[PDB]
Amino acid sequence: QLITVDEKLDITTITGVPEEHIKTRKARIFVPARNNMQ
Amino acid sequence: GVRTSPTGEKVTHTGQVYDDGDYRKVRFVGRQKEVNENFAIDLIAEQPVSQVGSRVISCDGGGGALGHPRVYINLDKETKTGTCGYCGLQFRQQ
Amino acid sequence: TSVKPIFSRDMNEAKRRVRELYRAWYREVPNTVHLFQLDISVKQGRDKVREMFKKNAHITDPRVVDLLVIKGKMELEETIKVWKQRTHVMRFFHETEAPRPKDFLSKFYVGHDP
Amino acid sequence: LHHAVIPHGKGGRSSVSGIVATVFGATGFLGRYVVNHLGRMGSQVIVPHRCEPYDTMHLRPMGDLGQIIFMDWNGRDKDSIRRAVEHSSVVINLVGREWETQNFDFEDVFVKIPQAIAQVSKEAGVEKFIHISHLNADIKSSSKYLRSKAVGEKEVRETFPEATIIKPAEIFGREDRFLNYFANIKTVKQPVYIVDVTKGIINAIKDPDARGKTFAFVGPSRYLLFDLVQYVFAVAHRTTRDKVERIHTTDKILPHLPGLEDLGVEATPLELKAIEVLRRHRVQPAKTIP
Amino acid sequence: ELLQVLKRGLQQVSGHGGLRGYLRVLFRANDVRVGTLVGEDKYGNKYYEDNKQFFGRHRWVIYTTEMNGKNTFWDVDGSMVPPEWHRWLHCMTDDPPTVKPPTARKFIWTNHKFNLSGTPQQYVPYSTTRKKIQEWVPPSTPYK
Amino acid sequence: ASATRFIQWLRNWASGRDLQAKLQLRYQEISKRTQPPPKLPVGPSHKLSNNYYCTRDGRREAMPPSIVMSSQKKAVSPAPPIKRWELSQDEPYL
Amino acid sequence: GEYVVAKLDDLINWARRSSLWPMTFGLACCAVEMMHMAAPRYDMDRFGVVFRASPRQSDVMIVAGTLTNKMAPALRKVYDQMPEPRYVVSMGSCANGGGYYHYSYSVVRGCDRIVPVDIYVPGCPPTAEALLYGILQLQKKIKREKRLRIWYRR
Amino acid sequence: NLTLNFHGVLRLVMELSGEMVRKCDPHIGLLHRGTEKLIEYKTYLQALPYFDRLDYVSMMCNEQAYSLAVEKLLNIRPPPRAQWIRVLFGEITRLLNHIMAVTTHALDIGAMTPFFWMFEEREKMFEFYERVSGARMHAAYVRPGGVHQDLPLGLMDDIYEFSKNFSLRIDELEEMLTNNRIWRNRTVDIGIVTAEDALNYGFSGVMLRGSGIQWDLRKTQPYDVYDQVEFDVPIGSRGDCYDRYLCRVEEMRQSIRIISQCLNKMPPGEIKVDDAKVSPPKRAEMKTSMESLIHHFKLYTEGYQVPPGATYTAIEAPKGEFGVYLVSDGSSRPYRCKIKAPGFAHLAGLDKMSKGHMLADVVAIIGTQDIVFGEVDR
Amino acid sequence: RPTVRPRNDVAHKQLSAFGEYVAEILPKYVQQVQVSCFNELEICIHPDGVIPVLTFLRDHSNAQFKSLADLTAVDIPTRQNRFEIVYNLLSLRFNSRIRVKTYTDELTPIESSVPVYKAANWYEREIWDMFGVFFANHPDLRRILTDYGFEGHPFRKDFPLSGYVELRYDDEVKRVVAEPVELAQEFRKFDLNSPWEAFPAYRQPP
Amino acid sequence: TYKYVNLREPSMDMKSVTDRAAQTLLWTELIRGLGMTLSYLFREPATINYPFEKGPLSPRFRGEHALRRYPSGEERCIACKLCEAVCPAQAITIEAEPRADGSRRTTRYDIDMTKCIYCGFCQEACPVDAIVEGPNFEFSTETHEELLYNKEKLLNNGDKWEAEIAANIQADYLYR
Amino acid sequence: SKVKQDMPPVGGYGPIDYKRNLPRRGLSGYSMFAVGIGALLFGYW
Ligand SMILES: CCCCCCCCCCCCCCCCCC(=O)OC[C@H](COP(=O)(O)OCCN)OC(=O)CCCCCCCCCCCCCCCCC
């Protein structure tokens, strides 16, 4: 019996992470540059 | 090559010594600063240069498999010795 | 947007479970304070319960709410059955934590962190 | 600042607070709270002790590796004082006894030892000196304890003009000789919490204004000694001539001196903590004097 | 054999050179067995063997009473055994250093040291590297 | 190994075993603590020819799983039924 | 007055170090080597160290293994219940400073965060002989105590 | 219902009615050290020593289980001499475990003397560990590819000398316990588990065979050279503590029987796979050959890469089926390593097994399961 | 070839046929069947099929997987359903093993397998404790390995190795306390992966 | 192949029944157990007289670490950092720079002996036999800080124990 | 030089016992009772 949930997925309250390490952190999403030595 | 700073603290073979205003030297009060007295840089300078009759020589540091990886050393330059990259022994061509 | 529910099919059902958990926590605090010989008052304990519920007051997902209630009931069971010791119960209050600076200048003086 | 004493970290156990403190009298009631608060934030604490090393063990867990350093000293030996303070940025004097012994009297412990520490510290170039005196210190007191405190306070101020002198009322806490004293059994007392006094000392080190000043550390409420002792018995559900004379000295009111509030500390009522101290000896709160 | 057992017990008193020597090893090592003297190191430790004894008790040392200025009549310590005898005593080899001496090196300690923990000679850790960031030093002459 | 004959008889009788033949303490039967040096053999890949690594490369012969069905006749069991165990003829019953 | 005090320290020091009754927190691997030090080859009992004693009769706590965060309050509770004099021997890398689990979210990085430690026995695990060396070292430490000498100089 | 709040350390929350146990609730995690998470930050070689420290009574058996899993994912095989050494030391490890299991099980219920006799035997077996690896317990000796070093000369003679006398030491232990009416009163009809309950509750090893189930992984899913040695599998009939005790004693005898065959059939040759992209080359080769030095350098820094995949590998460890679910993402560090400890399911069965028994029987039942909390908590 | 693990075609063929057998019988739930090069059969199913698929494998006469060897989870953050639930079953009758895999996310419950295997009880508690996967109709779901009041699920890939808090004894409050973690020596992250491909057989399409 | 450990029917004839009755009433198996502990009383004990006697060890024994030299006195360590990379406990910390004579040498070499698991992986990884686990195991300390070894401590251990370490390596290197 | 490795002696090791050996001792139940009754009778007389 499925239910309809239109809200955005937000799991911050159930991950156990302290607040300072959610709001004040800046994640970088990238593909690492090739190591120029190789 | 153990020498003491003006404060009297021994300088290590890495050149370490707490400076005059460093609180951290309080850890040695009532105790002692561990310093190894056999400075390798001085001891390897005591070994004589080895005279060989070839342009290229090999070194394994002695003791065969108890030494270091075998490397071959070029002796063409006449203004300097060939030094082993592992053990520091020196070679010169006749 | 069609998902499997945990317990509650909508937020109205979920808020019923939230309020029931709050009542259970509310009534347990006097027994917790006595049983663990806590040096906080019952008012301090109930204030902490209220604080913990209110930091999640913004959630709108009934599945998330369900999980907070599931976890909240686990914590209650740990307290009521005295699986927790005094140190665990007192961890909510952070007594040995020196107050962290909030305003810009105080943070600027002490380090680089925001 | 020398690069090794620049603060780093987040004020935790493995952080670097920048404080290098020699704490004399660290093996007593007040010392453990002071050493604990210093170690909490990653300070370098030098602990000169007269006692057995066994009696210093409770201090070891209070700091990260290397942060608590122990030394031997004698109150009468200035060389042992010099070794303890020569590398420090602040010196904290918590030396005291509540009775006299065949080897040390109140003059030795409250006058000569503090004077020796202040003088050696000044010669060694220590920047901050924190001296604990007493609120009721007075050359005219019937207590020889309080007479010696007055002389020592004067001698320390002359020796190390920039000393911070703290004058607490009787301190209540788990290891006190105050609430425990009554529980093991005309005058107004204003007792102050152990943790508030510690916070006051810690903030005194950080505050550049505290240098050269005398503080009075008093609790928020004044009580009749009778009200207090009855309240102690109610909460608990149940010595020398000099000690009795101090308990019977009314706690001075000194408006001209700054207090815990001036150092950012909010005084803690006796009613919140009486249970914490007296639960082991085991209620209408004692009326105050407005 | 009850007589032969007692004779051996009496021989142990003689084997330790009289009653005083017998009682000295009894109170220092709690053991009065007589063994063959394998050798003695420069610190005064003496090393014995008896191959009739079971593996583990067939080799032992009687510690010197004085080592590096410390009275060791009653305070003996396992770290007092120097490395060249350590190999033989723990049965890492069958050859005592008297028969197979160690190779000589100029940097090898001539004088062994025992565990120095808790003494003024104890090891105290520290960072062996030099300062990494050099601060700017302001000029000593005014010109603001 | 040094018990008197009377004591050996007493402990053998009390245990009902001949303890002297299987002493739990070790004496001279154990191997010497100094041994002659070994000369260990080399493995099958120690060859100067007919030894290319691509002919003996186990990791590179590993393949991804075979997919028998993706959502993109007789019955069978996962293997034949296990055969019944036989009783030990050494000692079927303790 | 001073000869007497020195002799009385010697007596009480001798009695306490000659009669060291351990409570073993056999937390993990290191407890196995502790059992081997009780086993016949080393026989800790021959030194006056009883095989096992209850905490209320214990003079020394041997912390033999990893101390998890979950277990820390219980270990502190046992230590607080020991009558004095009481000593703690930290046995093995885990108890010494966390060892192989030092970076774990669930492990106390050294038991000396919870209780004061008198002796640290290195190894993973220390050999039964290494633990016995540690115990004998603690005996030597007790022998250096001067409780009555310091008492009478107060 | 009186509530009581109380190998490693365990917290038992029990409910009693008079002498009886209504409910046993084991509270574990007192030795949980996040081993499975830590392994994700290690190379495959760096992770191996964690397996010594799970069931820290059966170190090399745990090493063997991990090695076999890694060898399977690598698609290599260890050389025959290494396989025989692994079975040889696997059975020596079995003896170490059953001594610990049986005598501490006896010691916990008051029979303390066999512990001392048999721990002198364990002390000699630690010497075998130390002579091949330099460590008495955490040998880190069995590795993916084979073993680290060859047997020192003279070691097999000393193992023969040890094995020749061991069964007499077993006989002495049986003289203390097997027919002792007090011992039988503490174990007979205690903690009976049916064959069907044993399978459904996830039991393995002696917890299955005590109930008559004819299952042993060394016989049915053999690994290394276990198909080349002869031995019998002890089988109980009553499913109680006493039959499991008899199964363990008889398994020690069969281990001696296997050890005897391993000594006689030990083949010559190398002891780690002759593949220098997996197993490091000899030190002499590393110091003369360029290829050997490169491979040594890379094997000790990056480590060998493992082809991507997942395996569940299991062995008949002394305590029961010990396995790993090992996931490789293709790199030189495992992506996930779930450890299957037989004691985990066995302890989960304590509540079921304790029903209708007294408080002191709980001591016997925990002992008959052979619980070490290093493997239970990981 | 002495250094190469030999193949076993017989087992591979037998497991492949049984994989097709299970798929033909339970098409409602079976999404993928694969057999590894080392002959381990994996059944991938929709999560709704946990109880029917496990029940079938336990009780069917051609399956008889009476023993649950292990039940665990794997966290793969890049998947929409980050959690892979893995059941490893053993059949003594046919001397064979099988692996059943399904999936879920942070908010979607899975059905407790306790009715099928009593062994599943603690495995599901551990999965809940270490990953935060909720199992519906579990008799007593709660933490099992972590400390009381511990926040987070440590085996998730984004949970830090040393966690967020650490414990010490504080003398002022006379109890153990928890505080934000500070490390004297930070764990040193290593980048070990070679920039050269090792296994061409597993190359992913571009 | 299997065997039954406890599948036997007692004989119910009168002689067998009286034998069991005699055992029950006269405690015969218990008396037999007393014989066994009595026999041990008269056995020589297995205890060795530590520290005057020591447990046997082999050349492979993994004990306290030490840094070694060449016969000339030059350090063997060349700061390759292979030990630091392989260390399962991350117990090794290394820094290096060109020495004043241009040689490749360490300026930091720390081993946290309370992180170390004494696994010996570092001495396997070292290409020049610089870092070893020596034969010492009697180095317990009164403080935690004394077990945080720096390069000076480790070089002194090498100079202290080299005589034994060289002999042990000689005995076992042909196995490596 | 020839390969030298830890190996069993040529012909293998001697036999190793493993089967339980709990030897039978003592008298029959009849004899034990007969001695006990006999002792009682002598004591009574
Ligand atoms: C002519 C006409 C004459 C008329 C009189 C004739 C009478 C003589 C014949 C009868 C002899 C009676 C024997 C008396 C001894 C008591 C017997 C007894 O009670 O033993 C049975 C008891 C329980 O036995 P169990 O097998 O567990 O179960 C049976 C019950 N369902 O089992 C036990 O008690 C076990 C013992 C427990 C203690 C164990 C610890 C010590 C054991 C060793 C002690 C050694 C002997 C001590 C001797 C002391 C000397 C002072």
Ligand SMILES: NC(=O)C1=CN([C@@H]2O[C@H](COP(=O)(O)OP(=O)(O)OC[C@H]3O[C@@H](n4cnc5c(N)ncnc54)[C@H](OP(=O)(O)O)[C@@H]3O)[C@@H](O)[C@H]2O)C=CC1
């Ligand atoms: N506690 C209170 O109620 C109040 C306290 N104060 C002041 O606070 C300070 C400390 O308070 P408190 O902690 O209660 O004092 P304690 O008596 O509790 O401890 C005092 C310290 O002084 C040391 N000490 C005492 N005599 C000597 C000596 N002769 N030589 C060397 N060291 C010595 C002791 O060391 P050891 O352990 O070696 O004896 C101890 O560490 C004192 O100056 C006291 O006057 C002021 C007002 C009220």
Ligand code: SF4
């Ligand atoms: S220090 Fe080593 S042996 Fe001891 S508990 Fe920790 S991992 Fe196990």
Ligand code: SF4
């Ligand atoms: S022995 Fe192992 S844990 Fe210790 S420093 Fe060497 S590699 Fe690291």
Ligand code: SF4
């Ligand atoms: S000790 Fe050896 S492995 Fe470690 S950095 Fe030095 S040379 Fe390299």
Ligand SMILES: [Zn+2]
């Ligand atoms: Zn060279």
